[PDB]
Design a protein around this nucleic acid. Structure first.
Ligand SMILES: [Zn+2]
Lengths: 204, 126, 370, 45, 242, 121, 286
RNA sequence: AUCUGUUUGGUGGAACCUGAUUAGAGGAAACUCAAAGAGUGCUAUGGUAUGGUGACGGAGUGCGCUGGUCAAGAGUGUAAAAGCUUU
RNA sequence: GAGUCCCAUAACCUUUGUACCCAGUGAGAAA
RNA sequence: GCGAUGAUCUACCCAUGGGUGGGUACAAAUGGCAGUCUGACAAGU
């Protein structure tokens, strides 16, 4: 959409710079496709409401960056000891699945792993099978930093320490509000992670 | 559209009938007789003492149609033009070719006997 | 004696030199015909001499529409000034090998000493040039044929079909698919707006039912409160400022400015909708005006979307096309005429508005009959 | 894959023996071994 | 045969063609441009794994397309393929050429050729969702006019009903067709000769093809679908026709 | 260049409309553009008679787009009124169609007209 | 293409010889490029010009056949044209030279009052004509003296001759004893070679435009090729489907041998059995 | 159910038979090693290779080639002229 | 030790609120 | 002052008004199915 406000017609295409939008290889590439392309010409009445979708696309994405900014304010409002650990988006969704913050901290640690993956869980218990091991916690920034089966072993240590961080956030009437427990929680997982990546199954 | 052997030409000469004018007597309708390219390659290969048949074979009312073969042998050029279409009407007097076509369904075979020609598997004889 | 040849491309022309002529009695053979798939053998025939590329894609269309006439363009005239050595007009001409019999006289009209040959001899060489393709050109062709065929294929087609983009009807399709999602969302975010704005003023949404104006007063009055100018923009103005005094819901500040930008998003988006609506009301007035006279721009544009084009209203039987005692009578009696209006929109070049009004008054008197 | 097998395995076993599903159909005589690659899907209208 | 029932897709013996083995069977080729059926035929969807992407499959109506019955009657080698270029003749609309585009895939191209403007106008608007179809609106009897626009195609397809059908393929097989790449004629008995019989025209148009150095491999009749046609898969030898 | 192409000759107008009249009595004639549209979808039409003098010429002009898609021949006749009396209908029929029916006494006569239509194409 | 341009029911009798030359009319010029011209020589006292529509050059876009007929007194035996200025003599009971523009012949030539059966002009020193005889003879003619020039009498009659194009003063002849002979025009006391290879009468010889080879066809059902040097056939051509070859002509690019037959087909061959129509790469060529 | 016992799927697989195979059959790995096909890609270019052994090349010069235009002459042609062919 | 996304960022069923309903045929209706 | 440029045709009771029967679609539900994994060893020398 940002191209349409810059590119316009195919002869406006070759002349106008795309340094700001997709540069240095694709700018040459859209210049190449500009001269030979199977599409038609478009009138200046038809370049009015593609010329006003290019506004309304951009104003959505410019609103969404204000919108994820709004949760990052609300993470550090409600549970900042949580969102120093797992990030704004997971903690937006772990609260969203349970409901209130108080309802989430009353759950134990091991049910904060599998808070998302409830469809594959109760299938795997009602028929005798294997429980899913990540859950909604899998899209944390830290499970992705691990590899292999170590995505499982960090998914315990997070859901333990996130359960430690949540109860300091739901159930402390005084909050230091700096993520002071949470950054002590994340440094324990990074010690757990870099221990667990140093160990390897191979033979030396 | 009637295919023609070497043998049907040879016994046409001994029995004193025209091809085109004499076929219409047996057949009672109009016909376009057409010698293939393999069959003309036999009539030349028969040699000097069959050359009066080779004159009568090249007649502009006798049509010619080519074929895509690697061979002269027209006894098996002919059946292969018959299975794949079944519009033709074979004119032979070879004994082995008659047995090769009487097993094929629905192909009017035509031979020469006595005075005029005879047809076999036409349902519309008269 | 086929000395030079000429192969045409979307990337300009080419003038080749025949180094060796293939032997011409023996041209149906397996040997000389299987040489021309083999680039080692075909090179001994052909050397490139010239390659003048087209100056632009628009000049290509003018030149590609000139070969199919049979005539000689500017550049095709201009290339042959270089490459062909000037020979006599009567004795010992110069031979050029042309792909077309029809192009033949138009060269000799311009260049009287050039004899144009299109035998099955000469056309065998030109067909050889297509097969080995870009390897003959030794990289002088900047870009490729494979992109150049595609655009020049569509542009040659669009010229001879001759449809303007203003005649196109996918603009009716995409706009209907866009107006319905605007209507899907404008109430949706405004219902979100009230469920944000219920924490501050539950009374104003009762006064203001329109989603377009309810998102403006949130932009206008962020807090309580009299002496409000745009609240008169008058009966609801005093009914709101007094209701602003009688407030029940609670009161933060950045959180409401979230709702301010969120209620900003509604009023800008419905402004786009009223902008998009007039475009569709105009393109209906452009593309299918005889259909626009009967039912109007909106319901006319709905039918083209459910047909998937404007063509599939013309192809369908009038009983089959469907719009919604009057059901049994008028919904059939209009759908006959609704079919007929959509025929004469499709197959005219510039459709007339006048016959739709003529077709409209026929439908009126059956409504008078009811 | 070896997941989602049961609603697939019942389906393919109901196609290898599809001659019995209705006594008026009588399909051609074929064997229909289970192919290596397939993609069960529905019909959009 | 409803919108509810779920169908197994399975790859056909020919590449690029797919069989929909349901309670009844269907012939199906993968839609290159999803979400739209070009003439209203009922289309199948699946999903393939990020959430799984949507791949849509379009049914291949036999009674609409003369090519379509020959698959479903059974041809040994159909020279159309998911990589090959293919030349098409007489594509009035996207009744069949949109199908032939989907079976050659996003790599290979298809050259739609038809003379008339109003069906050709529809062929334009379909060709701007399928990038393979580049449509040519010149007459098929004069191939020197569109010689700039097509280069070295791998199999022509012939859906012309003009009675000079052998000469209109020879001028497109000699000048555009890559050697040793097949030719799929579709002969209609009534439109060539209405005086002589159905079977004579089949024995006449094969022998006209063998004059133009096309050895025809096989011949199908496609009788239960369409009345009295043939499609004759050729091969353009040009060199060693024997 | 004209939009009502191909328009038939005066001698061919007679031979078409006379075949229309017997097909009217044998019930193979289907009468009306909205009814002739359907037989193109069912695939059972033999050929299409169209009236050139109906106003407009474009209300029925969808049929050659629909016929040449399916290789069904078609003509133009000059009068919708004279197609009316050939049709046996009190009102001028501006578009007619001949259905394929194999028990046709006029089967040898239809194919004489149909062969003289493909001559125009 | 190996097809006909046009077929002409020319004569009610036999044709006896064809020759080809584009005329040079005093009134106009018939086109070299758009048409080609055949001339025939009949039994029934008849010589007929023929136009041909030719599809070679695409420079253009009437007169498809039979421009004008030349009637005579005696039955015509053979023809050849003279490449300078629209000139051809006929073979008959009297060889008599023709102008294309004149219906009656210009000059009657005869060494003696005997029938004459075949002719050919030479390629260079163009005015020299060679004339056979059924009275087992050969009489050479010279046009610029308007006179016959000398005579040689062989043991059996000569069916056809041919001048070499390259040396232009030696002519090979085809003799009815199963042998062919090769002369010098200067000294007809000694033949330059004989070619003893056949078993029956040779009906036609043709000198290669290379000037090395001579190709001959006999009343035996076979065709020999020999060089000028070796005096014997290096190569014999035969198939079952040809009988009694009456006419044989070497190609003009000197590679493919044409061969007329009594069986009615025109069979064409190669000169060397190995030379191909392929154009060969630098590795294969060496 | 200490009711019976067929059907379907899974395991197992004897006797006879019929087919094929054999220094018993089979699996796993790869920047290994070695035979041998089939297809594709690559400018894959001396039709007789360079302008030149001071016996050389450059420059001018003369001849020769090539083109169209002008002019005479020849030929056809007509009563003549027009037109007309022209190594 | 331990199957997420194939969507519990859902699907289905039920209950209420809202809106609505019981393609073809082809030559007669009006007196 | 008609029509192929289309005439015609496709649950209940209550005296031109309504209720009851079902179906389609939308939206809502802190309605339902629907219950929130294991618990002490592991890794290094
Ligand atoms: Zn054969």
């Amino acid at each position: 959409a940002r191209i349409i406000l810059t590119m316009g017609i195919r002869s406006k295409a070759s002349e106008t710079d795309l340094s700001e939008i997709l540069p240095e290889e694709i700018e040459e590439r859209v210049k190449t496709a500009a001269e030979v392309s199977m599409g038609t010409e478009i009138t200046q009445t038809d370049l009015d409401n593609i010329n006003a979708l290019a506004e309304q696309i951009v104003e959505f994405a410019a609103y969404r960056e204000q919108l994820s900014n709004y949760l990052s304010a609300r993470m550090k409002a409600i549970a900042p000891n949580l969102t120093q650990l797992v990030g704004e988006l997971v903690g937006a969704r772990l609260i969203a699945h349970s409901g209130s913050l108080i309802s989430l901290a009353k759950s134990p640690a091991s049910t904060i792993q599998i808070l998302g993956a409830e469809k594959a869980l109760f299938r795997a218990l009602k028929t005798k099978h294997d429980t899913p091991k990540y859950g909604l916690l899998y899209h944390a920034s830290l499970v992705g930093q691990a590899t292999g089966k170590n995505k499982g072993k960090i998914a315990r240590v997070l859901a333990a320490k996130a359960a430690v961080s949540l109860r300091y956030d739901a159930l402390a009437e005084d909050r230091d509000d700096s993520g002071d427990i949470g950054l002590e929680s994340r440094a324990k997982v990074e010690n757990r992670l870099s221990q667990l990546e140093g160990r390897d199954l191979r033979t030396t | 559209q009637v295919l023609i052997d070497t043998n049907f030409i040879n016994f046409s000469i001994q029995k004193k009938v025209d091809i085109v004018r004499g076929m219409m007597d047996c057949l009672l309708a109009k016909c376009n007789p057409l010698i293939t390219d393999c069959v003309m390659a036999e009539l030349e290969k028969l040699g000097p003492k069959y050359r009066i048949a080779l004159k009568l074979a090249r007649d502009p009312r006798i049509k010619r149609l080519s074929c895509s073969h690697k061979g002269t042998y027209a006894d098996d050029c002919l059946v292969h033009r018959v299975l794949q279409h079944k519009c033709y009407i074979v004119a032979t007097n070879d004994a082995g070719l008659k047995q090769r076509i009487r097993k094929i369904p629905g192909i009017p075979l035509m031979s020469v006997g006595g005075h005029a020609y005879v047809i076999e598997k036409l349902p519309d004889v008269f | 004696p086929i000395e030079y040849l000429l192969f045409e491309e979307p990337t300009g022309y080419a003038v080749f030199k025949v180094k060796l002529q293939q032997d011409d009695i023996g041209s149906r053979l397996k040997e000389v015909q299987e040489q021309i798939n083999d680039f080692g053998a075909f090179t001994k025939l052909i050397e490139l001499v010239s390659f003048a590329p087209f100056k632009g894609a628009a000049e290509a269309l003018e030149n590609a529409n000139d070969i199919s006439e049979g005539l000689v363009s500017e550049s095709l005239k201009a290339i042959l000034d270089l490459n062909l050595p000037k020979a006599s007009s009567k004795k010992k001409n110069i031979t050029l090998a042309i792909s077309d019999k029809n192009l033949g006289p138009s060269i000799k009209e311009e260049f009287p000493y050039v004899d144009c040959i299109s035998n099955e001899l000469a056309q065998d060489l030109i067909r050889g040039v297509r097969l080995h393709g870009e390897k003959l050109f030794k990289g002088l062709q900047s870009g490729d044929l494979e992109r150049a065929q595609l655009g020049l294929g569509h542009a040659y087609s669009r010229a001879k079909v001759k449809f303007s983009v203003q005649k196109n009807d996918n603009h009716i399709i995409q706009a209907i698919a866009l107006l319905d999602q605007l209507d899907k969302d404008i109430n949706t975010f405004a219902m979100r707006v009230k469920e944000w704005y219920g924490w501050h003023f539950p009374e104003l949404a009762k006064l203001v039912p329109d989603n377009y104006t309810f998102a403006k007063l949130v932009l206008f009055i962020k807090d309580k409160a009299x002496x409000x100018x745009x609240x008169x923009x008058x009966x609801x103005x005093x009914x709101x400022x007094x209701x602003x005094x009688x407030x029940x819901x609670x009161x933060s500040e950045t959180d409401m400015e979230n709702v301010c930008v969120f209620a900003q998003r509604v009023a800008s988006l419905a402004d786009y909708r009223r902008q998009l609506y007039d475009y569709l009301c105009e393109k209906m007035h452009t593309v299918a005006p005889n259909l626009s006279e009967l039912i109007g721009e909106v319901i006319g544009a709905r039918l083209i979307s459910h047909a998937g084009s404007l063509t599939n209203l013309s192809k369908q039987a009038a009983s089959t096309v469907q719009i919604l005692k009057n059901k049994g009578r008028i919904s059939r009696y209009l759908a006959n005429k609704c079919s007929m209006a959509s025929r004469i929109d499709n197959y005219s070049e510039e459709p007339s508005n006048v016959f739709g009004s003529v077709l409209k008054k026929q439908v009126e008197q059956r409504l008078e009959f009811y | 894959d070896d997941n989602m097998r049961r609603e697939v395995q019942r389906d393919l076993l109901l196609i290898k023996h599809r001659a019995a599903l209705d006594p008026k159909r009588h399909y051609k005589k074929q064997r229909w071994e289970v192919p290596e690659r397939f993609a069960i899907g529905t019909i959009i209208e | 045969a409803r919108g509810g029932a779920k169908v197994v897709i399975e790859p056909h013996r020919h590449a690029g063609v797919y069989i929909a083995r349901g309670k009844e069977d269907l012939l199906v080729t993968k839609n290159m441009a999803p979400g739209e059926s070009v003439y209203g035929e009922k289309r199948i969807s699946v999903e393939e794994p990020v959430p799984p992407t949507k791949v849509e499959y379009r049914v291949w109506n036999p009674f609409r397309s003369k090519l379509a019955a020959g698959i479903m009657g059974g041809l040994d080698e159909l020279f159309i393929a998911p990589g090959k270029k293919v030349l098409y003749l007489g594509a009035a609309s996207g009744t069949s050429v949109s199908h032939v585009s989907d079976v050659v895939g996003p790599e290979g191209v298809v050259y739609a050729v038809e003379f008339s403007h109003r069906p050709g106008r529809e062929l334009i608007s379909m060709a701007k969702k399928r990038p393979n179809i580049i449509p040519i609106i010149e007459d098929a009897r004069h191939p020197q006019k569109y010689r700039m626009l097509i280069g070295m195609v791998d199999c022509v397809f012939a859906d012309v009903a003009q009675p000079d059908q052998a000469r209109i393929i020879a001028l497109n097989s000699h000048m555009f067709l890559k050697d040793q790449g097949g030719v799929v004629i579709s002969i209609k008995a009534n439109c060539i000769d209405s005086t002589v019989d159905a079977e004579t025209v089949f024995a006449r148009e094969v022998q006209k093809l063998r004059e133009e150095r096309i050895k025809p491999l096989e011949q199908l009749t496609l009788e239960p679908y369409e009345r009295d046609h043939c499609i004759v898969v050729g091969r353009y030898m040009r060199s060693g026709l024997k | 260049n004209p939009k009502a192409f191909p328009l038939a000759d005066a001698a061919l107008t007679q031979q078409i409309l006379d075949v229309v009249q017997q097909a009217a009595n044998l019930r193979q004639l289907k009468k009306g553009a909205n009814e002739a549209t359907k037989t193109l979808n069912r695939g059972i039409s033999e050929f299409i008679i169209m009236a050139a003098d109906c106003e407009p010429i474009e209300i029925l002009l969808h049929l050659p787009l629909l016929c040449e898609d399916k290789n069904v021949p078609y003509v133009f006749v000059p009068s919708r009124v004279a197609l009316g009396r050939a049709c046996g209908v009190s009102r001028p029929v501006i578009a007619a169609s001949i259905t394929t029916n194999d028990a046709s006494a006029i089967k040898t006569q239809i194919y004489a007209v149909k062969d003289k239509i493909e001559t125009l194409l | 293409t190996r097809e006909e341009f046009v077929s002409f029911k020319a004569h009610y009798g036999l044709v006896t010889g064809l020759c080809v030359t584009q005329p040079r009319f005093h009134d106009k010029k018939p086109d070299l490029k758009s048409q080609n011209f055949m001339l025939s020589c009949s039994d029934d006292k008849t010589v007929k010009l023929w136009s041909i529509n030719v599809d070679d050059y695409s420079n253009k876009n009437n007169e498809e056949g039979l421009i004008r007929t030349f009637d005579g007194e005696s039955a015509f035996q053979g023809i050849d044209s003279h490449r300078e200025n629209s000139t051809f003599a006929t073979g008959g009971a009297k060889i008599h030279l023709w102008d294309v523009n004149r219906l009656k012949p210009v000059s009657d030539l005869s060494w003696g009052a005997d029938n004459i059966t075949s002719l050919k002009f030479n390629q260079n020193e163009t005015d020299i004509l060679a004339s056979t005889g059924s009275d087992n003879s050969i009489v050479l003619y010279d046009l610029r003296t308007n006179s016959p020039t000398q005579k040689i009498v062989q043991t059996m009659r000569t069916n056809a001759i041919c001048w070499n194009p390259m040396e232009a003063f030696n002519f090979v002849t085809a003799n009815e004893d199963h042998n062919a002979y090769y002369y010098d025009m200067r000294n007809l006391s000694r033949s330059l070679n004989v070619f003893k290879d056949h078993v029956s009468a040779v009906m036609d010889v043709d000198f290669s435009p290379t000037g090395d080879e001579i190709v001959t066809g006999s009343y035996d059902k076979s065709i020999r090729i020999y060089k000028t040097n070796h005096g014997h056939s290096r190569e014999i051509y035969h198939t079952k489907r040809m009988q009694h070859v009456f006419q044989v002509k070497y190609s003009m690019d000197s590679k493919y041998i044409i061969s007329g037959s009594d069986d009615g087909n025109v069979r064409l061959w190669r000169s060397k059995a190995w030379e191909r129509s392929n154009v060969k790469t630098t590795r294969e060529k060496n």
